[PDB]
Amino acid sequence: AMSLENVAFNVVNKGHFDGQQGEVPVSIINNTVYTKVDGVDVELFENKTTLPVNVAFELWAKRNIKPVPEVKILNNLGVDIAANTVIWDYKRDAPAHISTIGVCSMTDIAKKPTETICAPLTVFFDGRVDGQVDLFRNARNGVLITEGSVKGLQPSVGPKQASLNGVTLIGEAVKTQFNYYKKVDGVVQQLPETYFTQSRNLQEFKPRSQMEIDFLELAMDEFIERYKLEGYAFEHIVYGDFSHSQLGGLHLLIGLAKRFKESPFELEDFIPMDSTVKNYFITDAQTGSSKCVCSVIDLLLDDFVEIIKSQDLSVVSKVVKVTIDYTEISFMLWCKDGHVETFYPKLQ
Amino acid sequence: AMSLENVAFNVVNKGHFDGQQGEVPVSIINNTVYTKVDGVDVELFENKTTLPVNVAFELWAKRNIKPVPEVKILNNLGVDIAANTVIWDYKRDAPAHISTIGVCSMTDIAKKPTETICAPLTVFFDGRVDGQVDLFRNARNGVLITEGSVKGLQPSVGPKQASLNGVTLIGEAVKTQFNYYKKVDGVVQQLPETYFTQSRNLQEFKPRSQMEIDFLELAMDEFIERYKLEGYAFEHIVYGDFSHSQLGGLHLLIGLAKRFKESPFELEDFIPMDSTVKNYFITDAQTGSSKCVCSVIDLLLDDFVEIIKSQDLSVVSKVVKVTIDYTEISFMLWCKDGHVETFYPKLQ
Amino acid sequence: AMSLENVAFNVVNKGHFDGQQGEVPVSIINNTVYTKVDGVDVELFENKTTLPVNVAFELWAKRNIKPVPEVKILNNLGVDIAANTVIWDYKRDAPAHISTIGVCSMTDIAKKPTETICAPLTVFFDGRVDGQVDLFRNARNGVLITEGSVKGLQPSVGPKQASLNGVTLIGEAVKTQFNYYKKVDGVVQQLPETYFTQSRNLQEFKPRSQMEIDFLELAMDEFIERYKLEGYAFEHIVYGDFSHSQLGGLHLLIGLAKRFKESPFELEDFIPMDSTVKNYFITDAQTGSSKCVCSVIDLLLDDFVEIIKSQDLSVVSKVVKVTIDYTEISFMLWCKDGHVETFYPKLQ
Amino acid sequence: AMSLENVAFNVVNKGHFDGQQGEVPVSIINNTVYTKVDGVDVELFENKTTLPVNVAFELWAKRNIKPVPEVKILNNLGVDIAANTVIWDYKRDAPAHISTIGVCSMTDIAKKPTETICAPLTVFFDGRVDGQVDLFRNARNGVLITEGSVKGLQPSVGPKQASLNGVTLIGEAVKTQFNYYKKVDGVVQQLPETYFTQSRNLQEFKPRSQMEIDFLELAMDEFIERYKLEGYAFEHIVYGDFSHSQLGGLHLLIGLAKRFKESPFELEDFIPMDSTVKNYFITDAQTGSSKCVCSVIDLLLDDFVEIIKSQDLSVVSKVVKVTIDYTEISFMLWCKDGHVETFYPKLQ
Amino acid sequence: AMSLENVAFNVVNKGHFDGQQGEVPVSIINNTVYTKVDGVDVELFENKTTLPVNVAFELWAKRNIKPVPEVKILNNLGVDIAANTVIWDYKRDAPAHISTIGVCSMTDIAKKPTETICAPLTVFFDGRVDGQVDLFRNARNGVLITEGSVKGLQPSVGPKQASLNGVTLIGEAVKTQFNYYKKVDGVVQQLPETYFTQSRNLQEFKPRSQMEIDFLELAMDEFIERYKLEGYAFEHIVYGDFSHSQLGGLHLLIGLAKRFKESPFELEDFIPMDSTVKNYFITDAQTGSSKCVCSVIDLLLDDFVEIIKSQDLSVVSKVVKVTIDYTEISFMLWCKDGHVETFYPKLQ
Ligand SMILES: CN(CCO)S(=O)(=O)c1ccc(N)cc1
Ligand SMILES: CN(CCO)S(=O)(=O)c1ccc(N)cc1
Ligand SMILES: CN(CCO)S(=O)(=O)c1ccc(N)cc1
């Protein structure tokens, strides 16, 4: 017996939709949901989605509040819809998937993921919910996550981190590292060897290796010497070049974090979504050096060093493909006289 | 157990709110309420009120679908709020009253009209509903309607006509003529002797007396002769003068109806609401004669003739007060040499 | 090379989208599309849909401007989406279908109806367009219309009338009568033997048989005598009973049309969409007789007479199923002592 | 001392802005202006313009309520802005001009038309207002209207009709025929010899000559015989051809009016504005004959007959330029063997 | 002579409404008020309220700019409306009270608090304004604040802190500690013994006692030992337990502040309003420990220690009622073997 007033009752009393009975008075004005509290309207939700205000409110109330894969991973794995949950995309303030299965009457395409309407879609299944591993076994297309082993199915160990209510974290009190499984047209796929992005923030960046601790503490020249990175263009690629009007390199989040402690800068996130590679229009406040499209990836510095050291440096320009977050990322490698000139996630 | 989905269910299945159980999918987008029918959104309601879309939808669904007094009568009697019903104002596409009593959680000031919050307000009671005559007896301020006598209470016979779902009519299959009662500060008040407006439309005007039949059929000079109206300025007041740039007279709806059959004209209803006297910005299409504020009243021609013939015609200008629809309507009477020059509902 | 400015250019210069090249200045403000003409904004489109303003504008510009089946027929046949066209629903001022195939980048689920995404959906195909009959042969689910025979496919002759730019008409200069075909799960289905609604308006109703001419011209008692309709409750069912507060019968559009010439009435279309059976909240202006849900069907009077005369009148109450516009319409037949009491399209 | 509350006070008490002092409570919600009357909000204005709601309300309140030139004439004369008035465009429910001179603080580019900002703009002056003829003499660019002669200035007699509060009419109680004057770059320009459109409606069309009376009353073949119109394609051009899927001709409003009495049709006004030539997407309800862009002009039939009879009929195709409403209207004349095939206002 | 333009003039020139004369050009677009400055629109106000944009703008301009009681106190005391002022609720960006008395024509229910309409409402009076103490003496229901003594009335010393333009502070240059008085149905009430919340922020929390200084500086075990808090579950209740998926305890703002210096966390304020007890959906970033509804109260640690040490610890579960900010707060006390297990502000 779903209703706007009941969804509102649950939000007010439980912090989210929890299947409780009850109603609270609600008013909708433009794209905002209010509730009456002692005779005054209190805002419960502001719709930032392209869905109707009351439909978006319900999907937000019915969001998954357990640690879930980051939307970038789900997208990279080709997920179209989730089974009996809503993956809320906090970077977009909107549902990660357009349609639902057994969640909301307005967005439901089916009540159960076994309906023939779901057959052409990659359905996301959560092995932590009863019967979901079996639903994955019967579905033609799907992605499954589990905390433990699945008999007969060989796993792909996912990232250490997961999103819990919009907070990306490596769980200590909860499990955030999942086993990933995928099926295309009934066949259990073999997921590829992959690197993972670290999902760190510029403001609260923390090193996750001795190489990363040395990058943030040592001076540019001490570091490049210590890790035998001469001829690998880390001065340009990682540290960044701010001497010309166009900002040079600066494609790794750790290099942006090192710069951030000294001089601030503006990052215009012109396509605000979760993605393996992010594009920013950067303006350096100290120098005035800027770049319209600066691609940034948060790889562990050790992983980036491994990737750049595993390339043939004898060709002027070439595309280097790297599996990161299960997807194929194309990089542009530019070399001269056997040394790197630049290496960046290809803008295509 | 009120809900948006339940109100929508009742509208779809019952044509209005009928206390039935059930829910239908609803989407709200801007000021419109839609419901999903075979996968497509079908509009159920467009909010034209100053209330939130879902609140206005509920009050419209909970509107009184029995013949009820016209909003002009309720306003003239000082009604602030209705008891356990919504009087819908079809001329404004909005509730006739701001707040409610036992109707909607968002607009309710009380569940029962006996709450101390209601004491200062003139509450409208409907004697056709059980216990409402008693609630009027216990209310400090109120207006009561009934189909018959209430022991000890001196009645006031109201208009022949009532509004049934926005259609003003004199009932043949339903009763539309009510007894009216009013109380101010605990004391039953004697309602004045009053005339009533006829509530006719310009497009579908019908005569309701032999004098009105003679006005519409006979020529101007022979009607004035037949009814001894020489010196009463009916040529100006009722027929209208279109020879000058400013349109002369034309203050009785019957005169506008007679003109309408011959030449069309524009009536700009610049304050669109139900009222005993209406003001229009009129432009005559045939002549180009116009008036920014032309006050119009729909009195039965016999009643207007009686009012104008009961005036002392020896003073240049004076205010003539007439009780119409229970309210005092101030007219401006202008005379010269014992004859009427003009008589119009005085523009306040 | 689709654009808002290009769609606007075509609307301004061609009256609709016609694949022409060019751009005109456009401004979007709230739900309205304007274009600059001699320095002033001229409204081109007001969005009444639940789609974004620019998306709805494009689908409306790309509407089918040839005679097409009425949305009620397409709905009754289970149509989900159209192939490479937009069926515009003029009764809802919105696209008849949510998604598109090869029409608009925002609403397209596929470019060609052969994509696996379309397989579960009943796709509408138009045999008047090259290659569409073959696409129907290869589609898993679909409805096809043609002007003539398709080799091997057993036809169903559809209604005489079709919708041309929102005008329902029986074509004289264009063909409006189509052959209909349907497929479910790869199998051509035999469409049932069916009656068709006449799609007439109350305001401009025209008789289409001598029985209908006799109904509108003759008095009630002599029409019933002439057509041997004694004991068939036409006085209640077709003519309508306005003597009580609840309006009796009045379920055939011809009966509403006969009443309309004499006395006006309000029809509140509370679910405004195209459907075989329509529900109205009716209020009779002359009597004040009303009904919250009055189901109305526009059958040719001869067809209704045939249906009611083909029923067993020996049971108190029973459901009578009739195929109209390819759908099963459930009627409620009430009898007493071998005579009809009432017969109405059963309110579901 | 301009204010929203003061503009609202004037609208409520005077029917428009009349420079009166006073304030009324106002509420603005979305694009609508309301005022409180006996505790309920009454709508005063709904913004249909691309200007802010309160700005549009003020310009509408300050509209010219005297007979003024039709917007099509002002546009054809190149008018950009009006001096100390607002010409309200009733066909667009918006101001005819973007900016103002001495009217509203939000839209004013100047307080007086003599400011240097106005010099490049063609300013409209009204000789009926004191000092406006002199302001035209001192303005670099402008259009002037007067009721009589202006010493030394060679006049142009304009149309018989003018717009009074949105009603186009030939004045009997007011003057609607003006003398027209124009200046470009300080130089008074000679306005061309011109025909005028009649500005009639399809629904209330009235003949304005014996030829027009004969067109509406006589049958096609006898009207063509009586007025020696053999070989002039009036059967196609004026009467219209509804035998094929594409509607033939039908370019004169009188021909559309003759057709309208017999069979109804839909005219989709896809560019809703005032113009000498109008374009409609027409669908004939009786036949199903239609045309995406059907250009229509309301010329007096005598004037159209004069234009078509003054053409050389010896060339296959050619552009015929005719001055109508002061603008050059390009027609397309198609001939074969010395007889007209078609003649239509050329679609630009 | 109130107006939108005048309110805007005052905001621009005085920072708020100050009764000055003058007007500035204003434009309203959707929910925003702009003013023209050198030909460009500058935003003055964005409506976040459920009132019309211009009405909300006026009440915000007319807000009380002196230190005033926090809305939580006024709510706890049952205040319905303020006398001749607007208490602006900065936590909701809306007026604290729906209606006004002598402030704005759109929201005024009366001009003076002595009107009979105000009789059933608890009116807030400010003894710092002339005549307000006397108005409290004559009002049936009310709450009065003063800086000094009121003859005959015994006072209730309120919190040290007050809100000055949305900044909660203990005044050094202004007086923020008021004497509170209340009247119900004409009778001067005796306000109860109460604790007060401290109204501190998590980001800028400052200790206000030696116990609070010791809590923030010492380690958990040193503190619990020093203040003899063994068996009082401060490890769970105040410090917080982050070892399990559900976050344990953490109900006092000081404990959240201590945690905040070490590890960040997300507090989803799902009912954003001023209240004695606040509810947050908390997610701990370091551990991933979370709780949908975590009730938080900012009591001085000494006050919380006093409350928990004054309870009978012999019952498994019981409701403990504590007067905080004049209202009764129910806590849930859970004990086992004479020791506290948990104590939290009861979620009811
Ligand atoms: C409860 N209030 C005061 C009534 O004593 S009110 O909410 O402000 C209000 C309610 C109804 C009307 N008609 C007007 C104001
Ligand atoms: C692609 N999708 C599922 C279809 O297999 S959909 O986008 O959610 C959708 C498309 C069209 C209709 N009619 C309904 C749903
Ligand atoms: C002042 N400006 C330029 C005029 O010289 S303007 O504001 O941009 C403008 C004013 C009026 C019209 N019709 C067009 C543009």
mmCIF file of N, CA and C in Angstrom, chain C residues 143-189:
data_model
loop_
_atom_site.group_PDB
_atom_site.id
_atom_site.type_symbol
_atom_site.label_atom_id
_atom_site.label_comp_id
_atom_site.label_asym_id
_atom_site.label_seq_id
_atom_site.Cartn_x
_atom_site.Cartn_y
_atom_site.Cartn_z
ATOM 1 N N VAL C 143 1.928 -4.950 -34.602
ATOM 2 C CA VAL C 143 0.636 -4.647 -35.207
ATOM 3 C C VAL C 143 0.958 -3.950 -36.523
ATOM 4 N N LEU C 144 0.368 -4.418 -37.616
ATOM 5 C CA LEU C 144 0.598 -3.863 -38.921
ATOM 6 C C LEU C 144 -0.676 -3.328 -39.533
ATOM 7 N N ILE C 145 -0.591 -2.185 -40.212
ATOM 8 C CA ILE C 145 -1.706 -1.670 -40.995
ATOM 9 C C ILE C 145 -1.293 -1.607 -42.461
ATOM 10 N N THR C 146 -2.210 -1.850 -43.383
ATOM 11 C CA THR C 146 -1.914 -1.757 -44.801
ATOM 12 C C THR C 146 -3.124 -1.194 -45.538
ATOM 13 N N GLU C 147 -2.908 -0.729 -46.778
ATOM 14 C CA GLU C 147 -3.999 -0.278 -47.615
ATOM 15 C C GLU C 147 -4.591 -1.405 -48.475
ATOM 16 N N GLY C 148 -3.859 -2.512 -48.636
ATOM 17 C CA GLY C 148 -4.272 -3.661 -49.428
ATOM 18 C C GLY C 148 -3.786 -4.991 -48.876
ATOM 19 N N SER C 149 -3.853 -6.045 -49.705
ATOM 20 C CA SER C 149 -3.480 -7.379 -49.263
ATOM 21 C C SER C 149 -1.975 -7.617 -49.174
ATOM 22 N N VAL C 150 -1.574 -8.402 -48.187
ATOM 23 C CA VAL C 150 -0.202 -8.801 -47.948
ATOM 24 C C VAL C 150 -0.230 -10.302 -48.187
ATOM 25 N N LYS C 151 0.566 -10.810 -49.128
ATOM 26 C CA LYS C 151 0.521 -12.206 -49.505
ATOM 27 C C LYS C 151 0.676 -13.188 -48.311
ATOM 28 N N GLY C 152 -0.327 -14.071 -48.212
ATOM 29 C CA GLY C 152 -0.401 -15.087 -47.169
ATOM 30 C C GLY C 152 -0.979 -14.674 -45.832
ATOM 31 N N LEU C 153 -0.927 -13.368 -45.488
ATOM 32 C CA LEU C 153 -1.430 -12.855 -44.210
ATOM 33 C C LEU C 153 -2.925 -12.591 -44.222
ATOM 34 N N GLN C 154 -3.661 -13.281 -43.361
ATOM 35 C CA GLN C 154 -5.110 -13.136 -43.264
ATOM 36 C C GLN C 154 -5.495 -11.803 -42.626
ATOM 37 N N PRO C 155 -6.207 -10.953 -43.381
ATOM 38 C CA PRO C 155 -6.482 -9.607 -42.884
ATOM 39 C C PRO C 155 -7.669 -9.472 -41.954
ATOM 40 N N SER C 156 -7.692 -8.344 -41.258
ATOM 41 C CA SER C 156 -8.792 -7.916 -40.423
ATOM 42 C C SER C 156 -9.138 -6.511 -40.921
ATOM 43 N N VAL C 157 -10.367 -6.295 -41.406
ATOM 44 C CA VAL C 157 -10.758 -4.974 -41.896
ATOM 45 C C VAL C 157 -11.069 -4.086 -40.707
ATOM 46 N N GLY C 158 -10.326 -3.001 -40.568
ATOM 47 C CA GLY C 158 -10.489 -2.071 -39.461
ATOM 48 C C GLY C 158 -11.612 -1.078 -39.641
ATOM 49 N N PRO C 159 -11.681 -0.081 -38.733
ATOM 50 C CA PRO C 159 -12.738 0.938 -38.841
ATOM 51 C C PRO C 159 -12.668 1.744 -40.126
ATOM 52 N N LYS C 160 -13.812 2.296 -40.532
ATOM 53 C CA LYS C 160 -13.889 3.159 -41.706
ATOM 54 C C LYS C 160 -13.058 4.422 -41.508
ATOM 55 N N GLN C 161 -13.039 4.932 -40.270
ATOM 56 C CA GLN C 161 -12.396 6.175 -39.868
ATOM 57 C C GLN C 161 -10.960 6.036 -39.362
ATOM 58 N N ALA C 162 -10.207 7.118 -39.500
ATOM 59 C CA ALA C 162 -8.838 7.258 -39.028
ATOM 60 C C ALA C 162 -8.624 8.722 -38.568
ATOM 61 N N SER C 163 -7.541 8.974 -37.844
ATOM 62 C CA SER C 163 -7.218 10.306 -37.359
ATOM 63 C C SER C 163 -6.194 10.947 -38.306
ATOM 64 N N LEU C 164 -6.523 12.105 -38.879
ATOM 65 C CA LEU C 164 -5.591 12.821 -39.727
ATOM 66 C C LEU C 164 -5.344 14.164 -39.031
ATOM 67 N N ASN C 165 -4.159 14.324 -38.414
ATOM 68 C CA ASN C 165 -3.785 15.530 -37.683
ATOM 69 C C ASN C 165 -4.758 15.881 -36.561
ATOM 70 N N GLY C 166 -5.289 14.858 -35.909
ATOM 71 C CA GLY C 166 -6.230 15.054 -34.822
ATOM 72 C C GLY C 166 -7.681 15.130 -35.237
ATOM 73 N N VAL C 167 -7.964 15.055 -36.538
ATOM 74 C CA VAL C 167 -9.337 15.082 -37.015
ATOM 75 C C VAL C 167 -9.734 13.667 -37.381
ATOM 76 N N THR C 168 -10.692 13.094 -36.657
ATOM 77 C CA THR C 168 -11.186 11.773 -36.992
ATOM 78 C C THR C 168 -12.123 11.916 -38.190
ATOM 79 N N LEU C 169 -11.894 11.118 -39.235
ATOM 80 C CA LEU C 169 -12.679 11.228 -40.451
ATOM 81 C C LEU C 169 -12.676 9.957 -41.286
ATOM 82 N N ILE C 170 -13.697 9.817 -42.136
ATOM 83 C CA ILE C 170 -13.775 8.740 -43.090
ATOM 84 C C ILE C 170 -13.324 9.390 -44.396
ATOM 85 N N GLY C 171 -12.166 8.964 -44.865
ATOM 86 C CA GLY C 171 -11.521 9.567 -46.007
ATOM 87 C C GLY C 171 -12.213 9.443 -47.346
ATOM 88 N N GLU C 172 -12.202 10.565 -48.082
ATOM 89 C CA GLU C 172 -12.716 10.674 -49.440
ATOM 90 C C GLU C 172 -11.534 10.972 -50.361
ATOM 91 N N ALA C 173 -10.620 11.849 -49.938
ATOM 92 C CA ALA C 173 -9.423 12.147 -50.725
ATOM 93 C C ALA C 173 -8.215 11.271 -50.308
ATOM 94 N N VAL C 174 -8.289 10.615 -49.136
ATOM 95 C CA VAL C 174 -7.270 9.727 -48.574
ATOM 96 C C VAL C 174 -7.923 8.420 -48.119
ATOM 97 N N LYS C 175 -7.132 7.353 -47.998
ATOM 98 C CA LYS C 175 -7.651 6.092 -47.499
ATOM 99 C C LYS C 175 -7.511 6.081 -45.976
ATOM 100 N N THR C 176 -8.623 5.820 -45.257
ATOM 101 C CA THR C 176 -8.648 5.727 -43.787
ATOM 102 C C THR C 176 -8.993 4.313 -43.279
ATOM 103 N N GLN C 177 -9.502 3.416 -44.161
ATOM 104 C CA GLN C 177 -9.841 2.050 -43.757
ATOM 105 C C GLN C 177 -8.657 1.142 -44.014
ATOM 106 N N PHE C 178 -8.087 0.573 -42.954
ATOM 107 C CA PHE C 178 -6.904 -0.261 -43.100
ATOM 108 C C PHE C 178 -7.191 -1.707 -42.812
ATOM 109 N N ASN C 179 -6.333 -2.561 -43.329
ATOM 110 C CA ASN C 179 -6.293 -3.947 -42.972
ATOM 111 C C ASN C 179 -5.388 -3.947 -41.742
ATOM 112 N N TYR C 180 -5.740 -4.757 -40.755
ATOM 113 C CA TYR C 180 -5.006 -4.872 -39.507
ATOM 114 C C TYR C 180 -4.463 -6.255 -39.364
ATOM 115 N N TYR C 181 -3.240 -6.339 -38.827
ATOM 116 C CA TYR C 181 -2.548 -7.609 -38.578
ATOM 117 C C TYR C 181 -1.857 -7.536 -37.209
ATOM 118 N N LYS C 182 -1.757 -8.668 -36.489
ATOM 119 C CA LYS C 182 -1.100 -8.688 -35.183
ATOM 120 C C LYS C 182 -0.274 -9.959 -35.009
ATOM 121 N N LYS C 183 0.861 -9.868 -34.297
ATOM 122 C CA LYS C 183 1.758 -10.981 -34.002
ATOM 123 C C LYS C 183 2.099 -10.950 -32.522
ATOM 124 N N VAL C 184 2.046 -12.103 -31.849
ATOM 125 C CA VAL C 184 2.430 -12.234 -30.447
ATOM 126 C C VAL C 184 3.445 -13.371 -30.385
ATOM 127 N N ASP C 185 4.657 -13.103 -29.892
ATOM 128 C CA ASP C 185 5.721 -14.110 -29.750
ATOM 129 C C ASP C 185 6.062 -14.878 -31.031
ATOM 130 N N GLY C 186 6.136 -14.134 -32.120
ATOM 131 C CA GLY C 186 6.482 -14.626 -33.441
ATOM 132 C C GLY C 186 5.332 -15.202 -34.227
ATOM 133 N N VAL C 187 4.161 -15.323 -33.605
ATOM 134 C CA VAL C 187 3.023 -15.958 -34.240
ATOM 135 C C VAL C 187 1.945 -14.982 -34.631
ATOM 136 N N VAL C 188 1.551 -14.958 -35.916
ATOM 137 C CA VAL C 188 0.448 -14.123 -36.384
ATOM 138 C C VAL C 188 -0.824 -14.575 -35.680
ATOM 139 N N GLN C 189 -1.502 -13.664 -35.033
ATOM 140 C CA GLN C 189 -2.720 -13.945 -34.313
ATOM 141 C C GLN C 189 -3.931 -13.557 -35.135
#
